[PDB]
Structures are given as C-alpha cells and as structure tokens.
Write a protein that binds this ligand. Structure first.
Ligand SMILES: Cn1cc(Cl)c2cccc(NS(=O)(=O)N3Cc4ccc(CN)cc4C3)c21
Length: 505
C-alpha cells in the first residue's frame, strides 16, 4: 500500500507528482485537522488534480465517483476500469502509476523510539523465534537498527537470543554494510524477509513476525488508553489500515449482472469465501442464491451475520436467510431515516399485524420501547407449514448520532449485554444478524465490541485481548469492517468502560 502518504501536505503532494511522477501518477493522503477526510491527488496534462474522499462512518465517498469499503478496494477498482473516474467537467482522470511513499512510520515492524535494552526486553518478554523490529540508532542519528529474536520456543535456558543489525543511511539509501543499497526501509525489510541474513557460523536471522505490543491482559487496558490518548490512537489505527492491502479477496458472485440490483452500492460486495448462500430458491429464478451478507466466525462460540439494510427487492431474501440460518436475534444499527435519507428500509409488519414476504410469514407480536432502542417480538414461519414458527427478537438501536460515534459507550454496552443474554437463553439459536446502511461501519463496530467483551465476560481480567489483530481477522471475512478512527477509539473506550463496571461488581 505504498501509494498512501500519511504525513504529506497538499503542496508537498503536488511537488512529488510534478517532479517524480508523470501523467497518470497518483497518491492518496489524509487531512490532519479533519479526520475522516482524505484526498486522491492525480497528475493529468502536466497539472495536478485533487479529489476529496469523505468517510462519516459508513463508507468512503469519492466525489465524482462511487462508494467503497476501503481505499485499497477503491484504487484496485479504478486501476482496472478506465474512463470511469471524472472531474466536474466530466473529463477522464486515469490512475495509472502509483507514487510510492518511503516514510516507514505506519509499518507494523517500525518502532522508531526504542533503545537497545528496551528492544531486547520487549523481544525477550513478548517475542518468539523470528520476531523482529526496526528502531532508530541513538548513537548515529539518521541510521537505524534491526533487532531480531531467534531460538527454541520451548525458562531462560540459553536456547534463544536477540541479535542487532546496523542500518546505515547514505545519500537517502539504506544498507547493512554490503550488497544492495535500497530506496527505503520497507524495500530493505521486504528483501531480507524473502532472503534472510546468515551469520558465518550458520544462524539464520529469519524475519517471521513483527514484535507484538497490542496483545495485553485486560486489566492493562486502563493505562494503555491513557498512553494512546496523549495521537497514539491515530498511529495505531493507521498501522492497521496499511494492512488492508492483504485483504483483497474475490467478490465475483456479487459482480454478476443477475445480482447487480441486490446491492446497496455496486462496489461494496461480499467476499465469495464467506458469503451466505441461499438454497431452496424458486426454480424459475436464474440466480436465487445471492444476498449481500457474510458469516463472521471469531478466530460454545457465538457467530454473526454482517449485512446491509434491505432494498425493497431484497426483503424476501433477507427473511429466507433468517429462516435458513436459524437466527433468533437481529440488531439494527441505524434509524429507518437519518438526514432525510433512507438508511434501513422497513421489512417487518406494524405492531399486532401479520404479513407475507414471499414464502415466509411474519407476525409483529409486541414492541417495547427502551431509552436507546426498541425491541420487537416477531414470529417467523414458512407459509403452509404451521410448526416451523420461531420467535425472532429484533433489537433496533435508535440513538447513534448521525455523524461520528456516541460520546458515552454505556448505552451500547447495556444494549449488547441484553442482546447477549437473549441469545444465550435460546437453545441452538443460529448466528446473530447485525445490519443496516452498507453493513460495514456501525455493524463492524458493534460486532468487534461484542467479540471482545465476550472474552472478558467468560474469563475476567486474566485474559489477553488484541484489538487491531481482532479487527484484521473480521476484515478478512467482510470488506472494511470498522471504517473510522473514531470507531476504533470507541471500541477501546467501550472495553475500558465494561472492565471498570465489572471492577465495581
Ligand atoms: C498484532 N497486529 C496484527 C495486525 Cl494485522 C495488526 C495491525 C496493526 C497493529 C497491530 N499490532 S502490533 O503490535 O503489530 N503493532 C502496534 C503498533 C503501533 C504503532 C506502530 C508504528 N507504526 C507499530 C505497531 C505494531 C497488529
């Protein structure tokens, strides 16, 4: 993901494209003052165009283009579909040649600030064979150091060790005292990852996994939120975003012509390997097996389905899915309407009423209002088959703000606690459905929080959580799960709040 430049101003971006790019060169960058605002800067005709990309929490919105689940998916889409991006005039803007960043600050293995003993101590306590990091040399400013652990993963017996390797910076290029000079640390690290260094006496300094500092015991969260609150949240979030290059899995079924009008947004699509497949379709319907939805399985375990708000033409498919998967609990993440725009289409009957949605039949038995949500008790059955009836409990969250995130996580936490006890009380209930909007932002945020508090509920303080690792695992099952830095911070705040209420228990 070299085309993303975290610490660049607009005028710096222009100068890079004009002096080191050509027509078709391009890069993306953030605004520093306005989080969630991004810019795509592109060269055309020896001049530079800047195109804004907005994320309020639900998707990336490219002005003059489409909506996307990640910046990597945006770039992949426009590098394979020419003529497709246009300016105000309507003229064509081509993304041909990514302009690569050399700044290493968003790489998992970069820990600029560490000293040698502090790096030895981290690798000693937290690392295993092949754990590595790169830090700035203290004794030679501008130079860097590579620290690596190697040995037997079975007390302090002498079967393992840390080694250090010095990295010179000479005329803006990096080397290990011999061989090739590299244009950046990334290229040097990538090269020795594939072709590790060997000491004369045989030891192979294998670079297998970056040092892990985000795995922590649950009673540490309080002091870690404090550290991260003093732009650390930004750094850690952006480090996670630079891993999304690894999650470009295929979405071919969602691109079929037969399926185009089943998607809220044409390029926000379900991965093929985790999509929910519908069986028992009307035999006439050429393609009856598609819904924009994915199974989320955390890696007596709870699983989820993350999905979009219905289209008026996908309401029947939504009920086919709930029935087939045996789901007994639904969470809605938005109002029907926000800012005068449809965010989650009504797909249930009015209170006390009964409606048929194709082959499925739903009764709305009772609504109950709470402060932050409405609960609707629904009864779902197949038409013509009496005792297929099951209760489905629909939890509609109603107080999420239109932009950003709640200022207090208590409401969300009290909501998931109730949703969790309902699910546990029903024997053999299927996955919990979580949906509305495009089903990636709020939906990802609710699911991740739920996974993390589950661990803490079953274990207690004596449990390791790892927030960015957990999100990466859920982003491998649906595109773009958790959209913003505000949502990312919200998840840490929710975990902190949950711990501090049980620590009063
Ligand atoms: C463990 N894990 C797995 C995935 Cl995928 C992932 C993505 C991002 C972050 C971490 N955690 S980490 O311990 O590797 N990590 C914290 C952090 C914070 C700042 C920097 C400076 N760029 C570097 C690092 C390294 C991840």
């Amino acid at each position: 993901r070299r085309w993303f430049h975290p610490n660049i101003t607009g005028v710096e971006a222009e100068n890079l494209l004009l002096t080191r790019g050509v027509d078709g060169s391009f890069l993306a960058r953030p605004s520093k003052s306005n989080p969630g605002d991004f810019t795509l800067s592109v060269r055309r005709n020896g001049a530079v165009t800047h195109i804004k990309i907005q994320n309020t929490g639900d998707y990336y919105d490219l002005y003059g283009g489409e909506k996307f689940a990640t910046l990597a998916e945006l770039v992949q889409y426009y590098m394979e579909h020419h003529g497709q991006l246009k300016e105000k005039n309507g003229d064509v803007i081509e993304l041909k040649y990514p302009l690569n960043c050399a700044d290493p600050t968003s790489e998992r293995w970069f820990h600029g600030h560490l000293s040698g003993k502090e790096a030895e101590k981290l690798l000693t306590e937290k690392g295993k064979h092949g754990s590595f990091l790169v830090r700035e040399s203290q004794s030679h400013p501008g130079d860097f150091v590579l620290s690596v652990r190697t040995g037997d993963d079975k007390s302090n017996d002498g079967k393992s060790k840390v080694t250090h390797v010095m990295i010179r910076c000479q005329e803006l290029k990096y080397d290990v005292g011999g061989g090739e000079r590299f244009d950046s640390l990334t290229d040097l690290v990538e090269h020795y990852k594939k072709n590790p260094m060997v000491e004369t006496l045989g030891t192979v300094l294998q670079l297998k996994q970056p040092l892990n500092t985000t795995r922590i015991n649950a009673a540490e969260i309080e002091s870690r939120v404090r550290e991260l609150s003093k732009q650390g949240f930004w750094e850690e979030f952006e480090t996670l975003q630079q891993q999304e290059c690894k999650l470009l899995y295929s979405r071919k079924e969602g691109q079929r012509q037969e399926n185009k009008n089943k998607n809220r947004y044409k390029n926000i699509l379900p991965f093929d390997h985790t999509r929910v497949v519908l069986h028992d379709g009307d035999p006439n319907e050429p393609v009856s097996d598609y819904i924009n939805a994915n199974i989320i399985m955390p890696e007596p375990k709870k699983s989820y389905i993350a999905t979009q708000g219905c289209l008026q033409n996908t309401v029947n498919d939504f009920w086919r899915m709930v029935f087939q998967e045996n789901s007994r609990v639904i969470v809605m993440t938005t109002k029907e309407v926000e800012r005068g725009k449809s965010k989650c289409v009504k797909y249930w009957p009015d209170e006390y009423a009964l409606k048929e949605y194709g082959v499925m039949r739903v009764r709305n038995v009772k609504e109950s209002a709470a402060h932050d949500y409405t609960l609707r008790e629904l009864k779902l059955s197949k038409v013509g088959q009496g005792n297929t009836e099951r209760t489905v409990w629909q939890y509609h969250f109603r107080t999420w703000p239109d932009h950003g995130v709640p200022s207090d996580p208590g409401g969300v936490l009290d909501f998931l606690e109730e949703v969790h006890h309902k699910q546990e009380s029903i024997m053999d209930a299927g996955p919990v459905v979580v949906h509305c909007s495009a089903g990636i932002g709020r939906t990802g945020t609710f699911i991740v929080i739920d996974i993390l508090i589950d661990i803490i509920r079953e274990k207690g303080v004596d449990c390791d959580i790892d927030v960015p690792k957990t999100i990466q695992m859920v982003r491998s099952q649906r595109s773009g799960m958790v959209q913003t830095e505000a949502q990312y911070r919200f998840i840490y705040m929710a975990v902190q709040h949950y711990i501090e209420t049980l620590q009063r228990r």
